[PDB]
């Protein structure tokens, strides 16, 4: 009823503000120019790295809590970006914006999916939310440019912060240790996208003159993704087989021997047996814990692999020296997906919209002139091109 | 069996060569430079305009016939583009490639969908075909550049023509007055994309300095699309009710029915009534014929509207003068879709992949440097951004 419409409005505004914050910086780029590529892609990289952790956190705790802290982070980071003047401060504010926007978007989409039960209504709500997400990137630049050129210099950022604050207030009123681990995760995700070397002294002449070297250096990520997509399946099959192999003995005067080898919840189960439903419940209750632990392990392993590869990239003097790191990165981005797809399905849509809007805006701003070459965003774009049309 | 695998291989190769032909020209652009945006986007514009007509033609006649003429057109136009040296000849060859590739791709995808009956197998085949379609754009530039800078000047075009010929031969051997209307349809689609004034004398300065003018000029196509999406539904609902009302009076005793009967095929049907199944069959078949005629009419009307708008575009003297033509174009592109989606569903996937690959390649080539602003491709991109994530 009224609550469903309120939730839909809140989620729509959250996604719209997310993409507006992503794209609004395009008309201001020449003014700063009087390095740019990394400053532009930092938010997208951070969000694309940190989405699955927020998904798992919302699965564990719940939906309403992450949205408020996401709104607060977005507000604080937007204000800091508005009032900052130094390159490092701008980059830090951009990364904070990325984390906050990712958390808010994922949690809001999850709650909106949870509220609607009927299939067709759920599809309509998803369509409206994704439409707002997609049209934010187009409404960004004109709104930003008109406010920038009529009134003030930092007006668009303050207006967006005010909108964020108003939406948070509407969510709060009208609607009716682990901490160190979360801090470490946030800091690692910031650090991965904050620092990136490129060796532009000889790399520029390399890509401009000959592109076949670029292709042979950058395509093996596609093979690595396919190789790494199977890890969760393999491990889950092994874990499922292991428990049933043990329980086969219990499956089989001998009953007293079975009770003896059983020998305190398991003891109580063995006593109350002397059935099939009990062992079914036992398997189900252990299986979920195994799944959750394995998902956490694979997410951490993927983050570690990406960090190690980005730390190992700069120590190369040839194009072929770039073959080894790429094979790493495309692996990790695969593995994480293998654990997240069965439970949540809108991560593909969010990543696709973000990447495609970023490419659209970059093409527009590049055409506008008449800036640096991002490394991880190229891999993300290649993977998206190859495997998002196939998935749909 | 062998037949299904052979069809899958043929369709995969056809789609791969389609996209490779689309993208391979990128590394050659700077060499030719030492005007170009239209030359790059002509093929995409022509294909996106001419897809639905080929879809209807294949629905009417059959799948095998269009593929062979598409292969022949692709071969001839690729050779002509290879051996040409003048701007007009290059543009004409590009448009011919566009028509041939569109026909081959649509017909092959249709036949591949037709062969597979099982749902999961059909999904797998569609996934493989779209994977080839999507990887063509990445395999294009490296292959083209390496062939260009190792051997010869026109080697990649000849190699692609040879591959086209080999695939056509495999299709022909191993596998076991409307004409003037089709000619006019082809010529009009060529002419729409061949000529575009775009008025670049002062549009660039008022587009780069201020972006809100660009937004207010280009966004209303999104509203026009939503308005025009309902045309087929409204017309079909009106048409069905008119036929139903006439027969409902006679639907209802027997004496009155005979009395009305007192006043060749229709006579035979009326005699054999003296039942319900005959009425059902009559209604279904006449409705089907009416729907087919209405689809043809709306496709022609959309083409006419687009042509009139592109002829009326150059007259405008101010930015606001571009508001009226856009409201036209976004209408037609909507209306055609309203008639094509219920029967065929891969048109959205084909258009999305083509547009997104084109934007990716344009961004790459623009980034590599260090002119030309397409008009209709911008509208297509806006519509795709806004309404493809929602549709998926």
Residue numbers in the entry:
A (entry chain B), B (entry chain A): 16 to 49, 133 to 274, 296 to 371, 384 to 394, 423 to 433, 453 to 548, 563 to 584
Wording from the paper:
Vesicular monoamine transporter 2 (VMAT2) belongs to the major facilitator superfamily (MFS), and mediates cytoplasmic monoamine packaging into presynaptic vesicles. Substrates bind to MFS transporters between N-domain and C-domain, and are transported by a rocker-switch alternating access mechanism.
In the end, OaVMAT2 with the TM8/9 loop replaced by BRIL (OaVMAT2TM8/9-BRIL) or AmpC (OaVMAT2TM8/9-AmpC) yielded stable proteins with reasonable gel-filtration profiles. Interestingly, the OaVMAT2TM8/9-BRIL structure is organized as a homodimer, which was also confirmed by chemical crosslinking using glutaraldehyde. Surprisingly, OaVMAT2TM8/9-BRIL C-domain is folded in a unique way that is distinct from canonical MFS C-domains, which usually have TM11 and TM12 arranged near TM7. However, in OaVMAT2TM8/9-BRIL C-domain, TM11 and TM12 are positioned away from TM7, but close to TM8 and TM10. Interestingly, OaVMAT2TM8/9-BRIL retains binding capability to both dopamine (Kd = 0.68 ± 0.23 μM) and serotonin (Kd = 0.33 ± 0.10 μM). Notably, the basic amine group of dopamine/serotonin interacts with the acidic side group of D402 (TM10) via a salt bridge and the main-chain carbonyl oxygen of I398 (TM10) via a hydrogen bond. Interestingly, crosslinked OaVMAT2TM8/9-AmpC also showed a minor dimer band, while the rest of the protein appeared as a monomer band (and a high-molecular-weight aggregate band). This data suggests that the oligomeric state of wild-type OaVMAT2WT is different from that of OaVMAT2TM8/9-BRIL (and maybe also OaVMAT2TM8/9-AmpC), and the dimer form of OaVMAT2TM8/9-BRIL may be an artifact induced by its non-canonical fold and engineering.
